[PDB]
Design an enzyme around this catalytic site. Structure first.
Site, PDB file in Angstrom:
ATOM      1  N   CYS A 159       0.752  -1.158   0.122  1.00 26.68           N
ATOM      2  CA  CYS A 159       0.010   0.279   0.259  1.00 26.68           C
ATOM      3  C   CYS A 159       1.025   1.071   0.680  1.00 26.68           C
ATOM      4  O   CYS A 159       1.786   1.324   0.899  1.00 26.68           O
ATOM      5  CB  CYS A 159      -0.896  -0.491   1.088  1.00 26.68           C
ATOM      6  SG  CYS A 159      -2.186   1.163   1.277  1.00 26.68           S
ATOM      7  N   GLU A 160       0.880   2.460  -0.621  1.00 24.48           N
ATOM      8  CA  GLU A 160       1.717   3.170  -1.238  1.00 24.48           C
ATOM      9  C   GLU A 160       1.289   4.310   0.234  1.00 24.48           C
ATOM     10  O   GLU A 160       2.212   5.287  -0.096  1.00 24.48           O
ATOM     11  CB  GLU A 160       1.746   3.881  -2.697  1.00 24.48           C
ATOM     12  CG  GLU A 160       0.386   4.570  -2.927  1.00 24.48           C
ATOM     13  CD  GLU A 160       0.249   5.068  -4.346  1.00 24.48           C
ATOM     14  OE1 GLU A 160       1.183   4.861  -4.560  1.00 24.48           O
ATOM     15  OE2 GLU A 160      -0.229   6.540  -4.761  1.00 24.48           O
ATOM     16  N   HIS A 161       0.204   4.059   0.546  1.00 20.58           N
ATOM     17  CA  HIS A 161      -0.091   4.870   1.409  1.00 20.58           C
ATOM     18  C   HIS A 161      -0.354   4.923   2.879  1.00 20.58           C
ATOM     19  O   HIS A 161       0.566   5.736   3.868  1.00 20.58           O
ATOM     20  CB  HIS A 161      -1.512   5.417   1.412  1.00 20.58           C
ATOM     21  CG  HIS A 161      -2.168   5.333   0.013  1.00 20.58           C
ATOM     22  ND1 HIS A 161      -4.138   5.085  -0.207  1.00 20.58           N
ATOM     23  CD2 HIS A 161      -2.175   6.781  -0.099  1.00 20.58           C
ATOM     24  CE1 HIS A 161      -3.841   6.000  -1.688  1.00 20.58           C
ATOM     25  NE2 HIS A 161      -2.133   6.098  -1.709  1.00 20.58           N
ATOM     26  N   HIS A 162      -0.205   3.337   3.346  1.00 22.74           N
ATOM     27  CA  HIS A 162       0.960   3.105   4.934  1.00 22.74           C
ATOM     28  C   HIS A 162       1.835   2.426   4.560  1.00 22.74           C
ATOM     29  O   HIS A 162       2.484   1.824   5.462  1.00 22.74           O
ATOM     30  CB  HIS A 162      -0.258   2.244   5.353  1.00 22.74           C
ATOM     31  CG  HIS A 162      -1.632   3.277   5.733  1.00 22.74           C
ATOM     32  ND1 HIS A 162      -2.701   3.113   4.616  1.00 22.74           N
ATOM     33  CD2 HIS A 162      -1.918   3.849   6.149  1.00 22.74           C
ATOM     34  CE1 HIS A 162      -4.027   3.808   4.880  1.00 22.74           C
ATOM     35  NE2 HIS A 162      -3.330   4.306   5.807  1.00 22.74           N
ATOM     36  N   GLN A 204      -4.396   0.000  -5.708  1.00 20.87           N
ATOM     37  CA  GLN A 204      -5.017  -1.610  -6.661  1.00 20.87           C
ATOM     38  C   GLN A 204      -5.308  -1.106  -8.072  1.00 20.87           C
ATOM     39  O   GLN A 204      -4.956  -2.356  -8.886  1.00 20.87           O
ATOM     40  CB  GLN A 204      -6.111  -2.228  -5.735  1.00 20.87           C
ATOM     41  CG  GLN A 204      -6.252  -3.641  -6.147  1.00 20.87           C
ATOM     42  CD  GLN A 204      -7.238  -4.236  -5.880  1.00 20.87           C
ATOM     43  OE1 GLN A 204      -6.773  -4.335  -4.401  1.00 20.87           O
ATOM     44  NE2 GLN A 204      -8.430  -4.206  -6.401  1.00 20.87           N
ATOM     45  N   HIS A 251      -6.693  -5.904   2.082  1.00 19.87           N
ATOM     46  CA  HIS A 251      -5.623  -4.643   2.656  1.00 19.87           C
ATOM     47  C   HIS A 251      -5.089  -4.913   4.032  1.00 19.87           C
ATOM     48  O   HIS A 251      -6.258  -4.818   4.928  1.00 19.87           O
ATOM     49  CB  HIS A 251      -6.387  -3.484   2.161  1.00 19.87           C
ATOM     50  CG  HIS A 251      -6.331  -2.925   0.562  1.00 19.87           C
ATOM     51  ND1 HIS A 251      -5.007  -2.444   0.575  1.00 19.87           N
ATOM     52  CD2 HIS A 251      -7.225  -3.701  -0.236  1.00 19.87           C
ATOM     53  CE1 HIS A 251      -5.881  -2.294  -1.279  1.00 19.87           C
ATOM     54  NE2 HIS A 251      -6.622  -2.797  -1.749  1.00 19.87           N
ATOM     55  N   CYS A 268      -3.655  -2.828   5.376  1.00 22.46           N
ATOM     56  CA  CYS A 268      -3.941  -2.051   6.746  1.00 22.46           C
ATOM     57  C   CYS A 268      -4.961  -1.340   7.062  1.00 22.46           C
ATOM     58  O   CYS A 268      -5.214  -0.500   7.778  1.00 22.46           O
ATOM     59  CB  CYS A 268      -3.072  -0.588   5.775  1.00 22.46           C
ATOM     60  SG  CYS A 268      -4.652  -0.672   3.840  1.00 22.46           S
TER      61      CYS A 268
END
Ligand SMILES: N[C@@H](Cc1ccccc1)C(=O)O
Ligand SMILES: N[C@@H](Cc1ccccc1)C(=O)O
Ligand SMILES: N[C@@H](Cc1ccccc1)C(=O)O
Ligand SMILES: N[C@@H](Cc1ccccc1)C(=O)O
Ligand SMILES: N[C@@H](Cc1ccccc1)C(=O)O
Ligand SMILES: [K+]
Ligand SMILES: [K+]
Ligand SMILES: [K+]
Ligand SMILES: [K+]
Ligand SMILES: [K+]
Ligand SMILES: [Zn+2]
Ligand SMILES: [Zn+2]
Ligand SMILES: [Zn+2]
Ligand SMILES: [Zn+2]
Ligand SMILES: [Zn+2]
Ligand SMILES: [Zn+2]
Ligand SMILES: [Zn+2]
Ligand SMILES: [Zn+2]
Lengths: 84, 192, 192, 192, 192, 192, 192, 192, 192, 84, 84, 84, 84
Positions: free
Chosen positions: B85-88, B126, B154, B156
């Site tokens: 996940c590029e955010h977390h 995704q 996910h 996260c």
């Protein structure tokens, strides 16, 4: 170039309205205010307009076209117009 | 410029350092026997998870593309994929389902796998992962159409309540986009 | 000294900085719209995963411990648990199964849950997590015996090939250790 | 002496040649576009399937063996394994289940996997494969006991009628052999 | 010219020799009791896997084709099939699903099976195998249409990571190609 | 004296005649196009189902019995078997499960299969079939013990109401008979 | 003329004689205690399997046909059916699924069952069985349409390798044939 | 004296009369076209459900009891059984599981079925039904032991809220009663 | 006039008397301790099964019908239902699936349940039961459409051989009848 | 030969366009630049063109044909033209 | 009898072509070389021809019919013709 | 404004009947007694009437429109009318 | 009342044929021998006839109607007729 084919999908009271293919008259396309593009994955270009088909039909009458036939295929509503 | 093995060697120490810092910031003791090698193991692990950056579709392109003059749908489903996940920066895991209507050119399983590997092993989202895989297949075969479906969980999101909750994304190109029958057949042959 | 909310606020920037550094070391652009807030989200995510450090069995102990003068096995199974591998800082997920032979004192679901939460949300090793949960319960109830079983999947292993491969650990204390019949019954009532 | 990367490079041509000969002996045309690269792909594949010969338990031994002073049963189940039947050179596939009663020393998943990998990627016989994994773990941990169970499907038997038929082998050492209760618990915890 | 029993007898020694050579090239001892007869067993096995070369649809054609003046869809699903990847000489296994709209002529199960056997027992490519079976059926019945679907797992891919990953190919002729309703019904009646 | 290929050729006409007679006795027309070849196909089918009479354990005995000096339980389960009820001459189908404690000598899958084949392809009674297989294995390996379990569905019973009803038989010899632990483990490892 | 009870009594001895002859031609001893009564049990069994010859749709027609003035689809699925392959005299088993759009007249379960019984208990061919059941229902109800689907496993094929392989046949009359929507709905409601 | 076919004919009218009475007592119109034949159909149905009264174990005893000199456990499980609750005259349905240790004498499936039929087709109580079947088998075989298990759903309970609730009864005689090992094995071989 | 509580009290004796008569006509002793209270228990049971007569949709109508101004499909599936076969007075059991396109008015689960209860607790025929429920819902909501599907097993058929065989009936009104898309969606959302 | 039937699939702005059957006028087919073929499994030959239907309609007008009706069926868009 | 309905399925370049119902003009049916039949299960007779619809349209023009409308419905392509 | 598009769904003998889009003639819409609205989720307005399409076609004739083509698409039946 | 809409389902060579709605001309409906009804669940009445659409089209011509368009929608074949 006497024949024309335009179409819209899912609902008829709203656009976009497809008004041409790669070999369509550039002037007519311009007169309609159409934009050109090639959707990713597709092997062809298309001219479209954001107007509802009704508007496009009226504009086309001014340029001398008349609706000869209208038909549904899939979720696409198609109009076949003829000029002279 | 794709990442290189040199970059990894030059950056490993930086990564290691950051993780060691993170260990302290968490309240842990970077000195515990169990944590001593952690900064490197963590750094190496993260490099592995993002090894897709050091590659391109080109490296795969040429290789295996035989011509069995095939022109009917080919599907490869239940391809396991692991991404981040590029955010977390927490991994999201799942399966990828692919289908394409060849225009004479067919894709080998090995290459297909590599394609999925290249894009999934990066910090991702995704939907992007789905489109990239579809486009890559389109460029490697100039097919009449291609479809890609990904379903994933996910971490996260799961590690905050979910493990059953799944996200499904798809990218349909060519006939897979324009012909509802093709799309339906594809979704039937994969949803087994 | 257990971690405090002040520590988190004081360390969040350090964590965020470390993650921003990691992003660069991987070859990514910490400036992408998709990565801008990533250092904080990642930092926040990692603090959540390790929030077990800021607690102790004491905070739970007193609270809910009713005396139904019960003296027969009590089991709570399929308790979801999420933890972090202390070697790679990648999570390992699974379920926890607990059983105990009360000596009059029974444990509330709420407290049990908290006990599992306290030790799992830390950098761990499955066997230690298992023992800690078991010992915690023993101290909170002074029971005739207790058993704890954990089955998990390690992401650090899965994302290198595995998703089906599972590790099972257990800790049996008191009658759960000395009486084979109690141990068998427990394993029977959880392996459903 | 374990096989070396040099040996592979020096023998690839010999393997390739043998496979090209086999293609002809079967009635095929080694010239077909589809068969041109087959002699090398076949040879490479066969070297990969037997790469366990170029390794030893030693290369794994030292590395990861942490001491969590654990003394209770640890199990790792559903480990996928692929091997080659030494009688027909056709692969037999399945799962491996491991368990051991540590004497303070615990084995990391990474090393466990490597041990299974070393012996399964060889021309084998299921019973030997089972014993070798068991003994390897015994030597690497000096445990109180260890158990290994393998269930597999033999392609050489399947492709002659079977795909459902399965061979189950086991090796129980130490307390796993002498204590029926330990043996039972192990089989209970893996047969899920 | 189809392969003959004489060919097999004349080539067995060559095959045996090649395998004995391969055994050496891998680092093994062709002298071990367990390997002594392997060159012949491997050679025979390989001849069995490719025995489809010594046959033709003709040998099956005439035999069993009864006329029940049937003109509605007939389906035979879940037909097990075992083949060999022509790129790595490793087997790919799966199921074949057949359907056809008879034009009075119906095909016996025995003949159908034989048709699948003839083309699958060769060095193959899943798409070719699929088309060959479809075309064979078409020539043997002159039907209004026919459809063939094959789903398989490639061992050459599995033993490199997959066992769950499956490839689905299909060939739709006649009404099966032109009529989406017939195609849908067929896919519905087999995907059970 | 075991049945011979000559016997089959000499008796085929007698069998064909009997079936042609049965066709008439049932009210059918042995002349219908669909029944014309039935007397022979029926006769052949019945000879196939009883081909185990033309063999003996001896023909299998010598061949494949390697010595891996193995002395732990080996199990082969889910072996499909087809037989004929000697009372009604209607087939009963199911699976066979074998286990044995080798006394150094191990049995190859190929030979095991043939053993089951020899006795099942006869007019049988489930309990006899079970004992015969067990005794055959005992004589071919002189093992410390052996266990055989068969579960089947009888068509002679199903086609009179049942398809779900199953008969389970077993034969336990040696340690499989005298040691409850061995018996239990075997039943555990097959009942999966 | 349908077969009569007299016919059975007059032919039992002929059947018995034929089976006794078959026993000898196979190499067995008609004198064994286990075979003594086999000729009669076999003969009786075969008459039972073919008892459909001694009946006609007429014997069922009149009886139960109530008029609930129903005009919507009625379905009866998962009807077990057992038949005999007319080519090998080996049974083929499966399920029958029926559907019909009543034109006021509805069919009772009892009669429906009888109709399936009448045609399945004969020497058959799956496609014919399917059409006869469909036509019988059409004649007994004069419906707007009817559909019959049969899936079965052929013992004559299974006991030669298969048990999982199934043949699916169908007959669609009236609206079931002309209206794709009715056909789809019918297949949806049965394929559960 | 067992009930006779004469009794049924003589009582059918009485039953019919009672049911016709019941129809009125319920508020229905015995004259409706749908109800006209109900009194007889109900009476006949009730006689069928109780036809076990007109039979005795004797009628089955002699017939089929072959001596295969078998002395190991034989099991027949998942035998469907339908009975009538003697308290509410509402049926209770389920399955019967039987096991026995033969003393040389074995029981045929046909006879076994008949035994279950005789006692279940009566107004019953689950425990009695269980015991009667067990005792019947004991008398017909003079075995070393026998076990019977019945699991059923009671419609009289279900149609008052339950369909998932099940009653399990058992009767263990001989070794099945005295030897816990035999009892365990039996329960293991049936609880599949 | 709907049945009343007075009717039951006035008719219970009649029912009881009838059942007492039935017990004798079967050959049983209405005096056995186990049978003494049967006449009343059976009578009470039969009244319960037919209590639907003493009610009307009106008693439910007014009550709970809230207006959430909802205009999209609402579905309630897997509603257990128990009824009585009017031809044999034996129960047929199963599930009811309801769907409707509200015209502003929605139906409460409580009322829905009551509607199914009212019509199923009567002597019925599956098709009528289906229509009555559909019409009742239509009258209670004046919806744009409604669909009702019922799948059941008939005891009167089961206890004569079947337990797996199921009857499926449906009634589609309004848009559920005229719009194939609505009908499809409904079947999709219930056939889960 | 007064009647003509042409069609295209999935999308109207791109070909191929089916312009004839086995018994179509060879000259007209040639004038259109159509190719002939029989798809495997099919029991009939067909004449096709890579041009989009619009183009074919214009060409057909020159040879004296007029569109009488246009309809969709499945994923196929069909045109029925008439000459004299 | 001024109106006529003919149709074909799945593909337009090949027959069969349905040309009449039970109450169709026997002469016209004969002129077209149509055969009559009642498919099992159906409650009506039908006249069909093995010619592709194009051929049937040309033949019908000779007898004075003209195509008024063409439409697709399901997998059936239909033509509505009018005489006088 | 010479062209008009109206439609109905599922069944033709009952309304509602869509008679206009956001850019339709307000007077004509009023003459037809149409209501305006924007269904939740849709990005466009629509004019509808509770009359069956037949009624709307008759009313439209009075205002000078003639039906040029009628076609089905999905579960929607559409009419294309032309004025002058 | 210049416009008329009739239809049939599944197959064109057999009826029933829907010839009118609740507000249809009673005389015309009578002349066609149509019956009226309201299917359970439906909120509207309908006039139908057991004749095949061809028959109805011929009868309609006698009363002055002409087919303007024919289209398929779902499994329903529809005709739009115009009088004067
Ligand atoms: N989407 C509409 C049909 C339609 C499509 C495109 C334009 C206009 C109408 C339906 O499902 O009925
Ligand atoms: N693919 C279009 C249908 C279509 C086919 C052919 C030409 C134009 C349109 C749809 O499904 O909406
Ligand atoms: N089968 C075509 C439609 C079609 C039917 C009948 C005639 C012509 C075309 C499709 O699916 O697109
Ligand atoms: N039943 C036709 C469609 C159709 C409907 C109405 C009239 C004629 C044809 C099909 O599925 O192809
Ligand atoms: N609902 C009709 C088609 C239709 C739609 C709209 C108006 C009229 C008819 C069918 O499925 O056959
Ligand atoms: K639009
Ligand atoms: K196109
Ligand atoms: K056609
Ligand atoms: K409408
Ligand atoms: K019709
Ligand atoms: Zn995230
Ligand atoms: Zn780790
Ligand atoms: Zn082998
Ligand atoms: Zn390969
Ligand atoms: Zn038997
Ligand atoms: Zn056969
Ligand atoms: Zn009761
Ligand atoms: Zn009944």
């Amino acid at each position: 170039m006497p024949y024309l084919l335009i179409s819209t999908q899912i609902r008829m009271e709203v656009g976009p309205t497809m008004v041409g293919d790669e070999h369509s008259d550039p002037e007519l396309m311009q007169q309609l205010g159409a934009s050109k593009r090639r959707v990713l994955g597709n092997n062809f270009y298309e001219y479209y307009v954001n107007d509802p088909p009704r508007i496009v039909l009226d504009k086309l009458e001014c340029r001398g076209f008349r609706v000869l036939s209208m038909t549904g295929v899939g979720q696409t509503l198609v109009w076949c117009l003829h000029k002279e | 410029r794709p990442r290189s093995e040199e970059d990894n060697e030059l950056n490993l120490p930086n990564l290691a350092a950051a993780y060691s810092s993170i260990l302290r910031s968490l309240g842990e003791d970077p000195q515990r026997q169990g944590l001593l090698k952690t900064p490197w193991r963590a750094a190496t692990a993260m490099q592995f998870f993002t090894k897709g950056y050091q590659e391109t579709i080109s490296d795969v392109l040429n290789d295996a593309i035989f011509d069995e003059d095939h022109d009917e749908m080919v599907i490869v489903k239940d391809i396991d994929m692991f991404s981040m996940c590029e955010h977390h920066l927490v991994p999201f895991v799942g399966r990828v389902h692919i289908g394409y209507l060849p225009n004479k050119q067919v894709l080998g399983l090995s290459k297909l796998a590599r394609i999925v590997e290249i894009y999934s092993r990066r910090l991702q989202v995704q939907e992007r992962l789905t489109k990239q895989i579809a486009v890559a297949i389109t460029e490697a075969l100039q097919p009449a159409g291609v479809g890609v479906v990904i379903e994933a969980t996910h971490m996260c999101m799961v590690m905050r309540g979910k493990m059953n909750s799944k996200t499904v994304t798809s990218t349909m190109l060519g006939v897979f986009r324009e012909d509802p029958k093709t799309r339906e057949e594809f979704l039937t042959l994969i949803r087994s």
